[PDB]
Design a protein around this nucleic acid. Structure first.
Ligand SMILES: Nc1nc2c(ncn2[C@@H]2O[C@H](COP(=O)(O)OP(=O)(O)O)[C@@H](O)[C@H]2O)c(=O)[nH]1
Ligand SMILES: [Mg+2]
Lengths: 122, 338, 136
RNA sequence: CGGAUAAAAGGUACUCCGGGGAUAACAGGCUGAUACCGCCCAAGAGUUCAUAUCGACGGCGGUGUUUGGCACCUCGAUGUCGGCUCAUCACAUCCUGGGGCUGAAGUAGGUCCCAAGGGUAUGGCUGUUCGCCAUUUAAAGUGGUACGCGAGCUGGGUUUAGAACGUCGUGAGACAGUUCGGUCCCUAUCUGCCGUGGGCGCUGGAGAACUGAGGGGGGCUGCUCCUAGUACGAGAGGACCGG
RNA sequence: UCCUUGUCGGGUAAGUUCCGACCUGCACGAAUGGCGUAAUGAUGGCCAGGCUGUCUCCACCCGAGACUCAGUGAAAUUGAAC
RNA sequence: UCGUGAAGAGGGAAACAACCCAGACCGCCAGCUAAGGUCCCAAAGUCAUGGUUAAGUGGGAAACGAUGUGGGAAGGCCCAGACAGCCAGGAUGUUGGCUUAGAAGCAGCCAUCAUUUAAAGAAAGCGUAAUAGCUCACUGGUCGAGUCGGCCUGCGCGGAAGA
């Protein structure tokens, strides 16, 4: 349930700490983002010694949603603090070497199982 | 995809959107401010490479390219939209030359490079920008800057990593009938192949090179002998040069002086091709005995002053074609472009 | 372009295009072009028609001109109401009445005359016709 | 210069009164000077080859949304620019759809023809229309609607009265100029539209089921996979259709 | 006075507003006062942090009208109207 | 300058005072007529004769283009066989000399050759570099009666897309 101009957390060791997504993708009049999506972000707070720098605009994938996901058996997986993983703009490969926090199993259907390979918790 | 042609085009960049003068008049009040805005920036021209295109056939068809002229200023302080930048799809490896002591603009080596050729004119100013107290009625406007005009000589020149030149009807096209996937027309008559049908060889993964075809020619400074400098232009980025010499031609003279003059005319082309490393290989060895064509093969080397390995290659028979490829590939890898 | 260098008056009344023809017959060459429609010819049209036919006829022969501007017209500038004197100087035109010759030709065969006059007839804003000189 | 005093210059956005569309501005219908669109005439440039593709000197037509002028007026009142809600119509079609040509190998392209069923963006700047930039998709269409919509909303621009700035005049003031703040009323009679009812008719009356003369509503598609890395293609690259 | 909002920096992913500066700038202008000025201001403009139905996108509920019944009972406007 | 309305009703132009006919003293349940019409709406010819139109032109438009069609003045050939078809000929000295790698009717120059049987050109077009082959003008045989494109003109077609 992530929309335009939404402040999210960062769930990788790329270097960003506080991030603000600016453009959700999927089609015309794309309202809100689910759990597995390509969303464009702008860096608002990052360590000066990190791999990235403040103000850079690039793509990212949400991993945790405050609203949650919808299991096909009437179940939801809510979270406390929406988070993203850094991905390159031209290529869809993620930047961070490690992933912090659990990632839901629903990301397999969205075809980003590499994130699921990381983040040993769940 | 059977002919290669080169020509020249005229590119014109749109001048900037001209300024406008106006005065707003409401339905009741007859006096209003100096309404009107700026113009639109002229459309530029971008020089973009393309994989799909391999010739300049459409450029003979269309010798003039027009950029979008910037929209004029309108009322209600309206500014015209910037003219759309016209992008021209060009095969990779093109060189462009101008007139009036003109020179090259930039060499294209990889796809995705976009080159700025024409700068469009820049928009003018409306009467509103001349707002002031003492004037209080600006009737002045600034004309848009004129667009940039030039004539481009489009020279197409192949990305031939491995370039080869040989005797007429010596099997240059037959040499492509080897592991090379290209299929040039092959026949016994001299100058069988006229269109450069470049090919590629993939021995193994992560390692491959491209080979181009250039027909032989007779000693002529001008355009005589049918073929000439117009085909030699496709050279000059060939990191290796291959020389093919026939052994015992069925009807031609045996190579004792004609194989030497072909070296001499390379010097006078433009710069002796920067004295690139040239490799000499032979052909027509299956016609005679294998051992008979050994002593006479080296005899030509010191006859022409050649001190290299003088490789013996059977293009049609297919023996030794792999041996030459192994040697050239190691030389290519150990000498990267720098 | 074609215009007299000196004029008796800087501007002349509009006038009318009523009446009949005077130069029905050609008296200088063998072939000529005669106007069938009614209208006006400007300096540009006369220059364009002569240039167009000139490229079709070789120097051999002779070419005559029977139309002169002889008539000035002015145009009113923008953002000017009715009045404030007469119009400003833009260009002049000529009066054409259907039935008189426009151009005269001689010296080359009829087939070239047909081609030459056909090319120059389209650029003229009026319908024309071809005639041949008769005795007397 | 048929000669109101022998004797007289200006402003009023601080104005008022009585009249006028007898007289300007915006819009509406004449109009095409200028400029946009189409066609014809075709010398020339075009590897041969004019209209495969341009095309100089000219001509004929069309909305006409810029720059203009003309008689007609609502001055006992015709409320603007822009934004929100709401949409409608024409196709000179932005995408999707069907094709022609191609200097169209396939993908990707370019031009033209038919086609209006549907869809046709989110934010910073400025009051903005427009435009620039950032980022998506199939695009972020062009015009009429008196450049639609205040008896629906908004008063940000324009904005009487207060104050300040620059220029002219001795001055009052004028000023197509800039800044601050500055009242937007109406209970729907009728036409219109959205829903729901009463009376009567359908030929004795009543309860049900419907046929259908006609009308309205929806008609958008991105990605991936199999075909298939197949056809094509030197390779790079990469199909149509169907599911 | 203009051109490429003047263009570089902050502020923003993107800033015709804001902030000290480059210059091709000198008119004002020194009691129709000039420069700086702490504090002060329901003063003009801009930005940031928390905050929220201001908004995507509105939904529900509590009350007074709007609706029906009973009683009393206007209005502006109106040449006539099928 | 003239007429109309102003200061004129009535009839026609679908509606309209300035366009046409025509200036209402009043009444009638009569006839004639001007402009305009005679298929119906709405009153009168579904009248007669000789033509044109295929477009709904009629029923809005220009420059131009075209085997739309009717009429007229002519010209070439024509039962000593007209044009177009079908069955065949297309050859020869001859790969025509330079630019020519390769061109030899088909990239660049024609003096344009003429003689063989004649009916056919050192030749207008494909497919390449010619080669080799498809062809054409032309003639021979069969079919057997109009054919060929210039001129003037009437009526038509495209040019002619808006809420
Ligand atoms: N026997 C034999 N014939 C060969 C060989 N190489 C080439 N040829 C023949 O040479 C002929 C002409 O070769 P070509 O493509 O014209 O070479 P080019 O003269 O350089 O253009 C071909 O038809 C081949 O059959 C070889 O190695 N052996
Ligand atoms: Mg060869």
């Amino acid at each position: 349930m992530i929309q335009e101009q939404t402040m999210l957390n960062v769930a990788d060791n790329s270097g960003a700490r506080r991030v603000m997504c600016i453009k959700v993708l999927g089609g015309s009049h794309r309202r809100y983002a689910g759990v597995g999506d390509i969303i464009k972000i702008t860096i608002k707070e990052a360590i000066p010694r990190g791999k990235v720098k403040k103000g850079d605009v690039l793509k990212a994938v949400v991993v945790r949603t405050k609203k949650g996901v919808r299991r096909p058996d009437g179940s939801v997986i809510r979270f406390d603090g929406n988070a993203c993983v850094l991905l390159n703009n031209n290529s869809e490969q993620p930047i961070g070497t490690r992933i912090f926090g659990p990632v839901t199993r629903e990301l397999r259907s969205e075809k980003f199982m590499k994130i699921i390979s990381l983040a040993p918790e769940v | 995809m059977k002919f290669v042609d080169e020509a020249s085009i005229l590119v014109v960049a749109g001048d900037g959107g001209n300024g406008c003068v106006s005065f707003r008049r409401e339905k009741y009040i007859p006096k209003g401010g100096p309404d009107g805005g700026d113009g639109g920036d002229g459309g530029d021209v971008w020089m973009e490479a393309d994989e799909n295109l391999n010739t300049l056939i459409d450029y003979r068809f269309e010798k003039s390219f027009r950029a979008e002229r910037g929209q004029n200023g309108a009322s209600r302080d309206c500014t015209g939209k910037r003219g759309k930048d016209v992008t021209i799809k060009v095969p990779v490896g093109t060189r462009v030359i101008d007139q009036g002591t003109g020179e090259t603009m930039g060499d294209m080596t990889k796809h995705g490079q976009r080159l700025l050729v024409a700068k469009g004119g820049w928009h003018g100013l409306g009467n509103t920008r001349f707002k002031s107290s003492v004037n209080r009625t600006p009737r002045q406007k600034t004309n848009g800057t004129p667009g940039d005009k030039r004539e481009l000589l489009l020279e197409l020149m192949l990305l031939a990593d491995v370039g080869m030149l040989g005797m007429p009807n010596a099997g240059k096209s037959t040499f492509i009938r080897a592991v090379s996937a290209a299929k040039p027309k092959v026949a016994d008559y001299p100058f069988t192949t006229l269109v450069p049908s470049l090919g590629v060889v993939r021995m193994d993964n992560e390692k491959s090179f491209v080979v181009a075809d250039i027909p032989g020619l007779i000693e002529g400074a001008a355009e005589g002998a049918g073929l000439g400098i117009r085909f030699l232009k496709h050279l000059e980025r060939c990191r290796v040069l291959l020389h093919l010499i026939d052994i015992d031609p069925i009807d031609g003279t045996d190579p004792v002086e004609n194989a030497r003059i072909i070296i001499s005319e390379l010097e006078k082309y433009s710069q002796d091709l920067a004295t690139k490393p040239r490799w000499l290989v032979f052909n027509k060895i299956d016609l005679l005995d294998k051992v008979e064509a050994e002593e006479k093969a080296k005899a030509i080397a010191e006859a022409l002053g050649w001190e290299d390995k003088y490789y013996l290659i059977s293009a049609a028979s297919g023996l030794g074609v792999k041996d030459l490829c192994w040697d050239v590939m190691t030389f290519i890898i150990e000498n990267p472009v720098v | 372009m074609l215009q007299p260098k000196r004029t008796k008056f800087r501007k002349m009344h509009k006038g009318r295009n009523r009446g009949l023809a005077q130069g029905t017959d050609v008296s200088f060459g063998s072939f000529g072009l005669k106007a069938v429609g009614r209208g006006r010819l400007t300096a540009r049209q006369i220059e364009a028609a002569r240039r167009a036919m000139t490229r079709a006829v070789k120097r051999q022969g002779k070419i005559w001109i029977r139309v002169f501007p002889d008539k000035p017209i002015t145009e009113k500038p923008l953002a000017v109401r009715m009045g404030k004197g007469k119009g400003n100087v833009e260009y002049w035109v000529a009066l054409i009445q259907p039935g008189k010759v426009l151009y005269e030709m001689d010296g080359v065969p009829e087939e070239l005359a047909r081609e030459a006059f056909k090319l120059a007839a389209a650029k003229l804003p009026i319908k024309t016709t071809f005639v041949t000189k008769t005795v007397m």
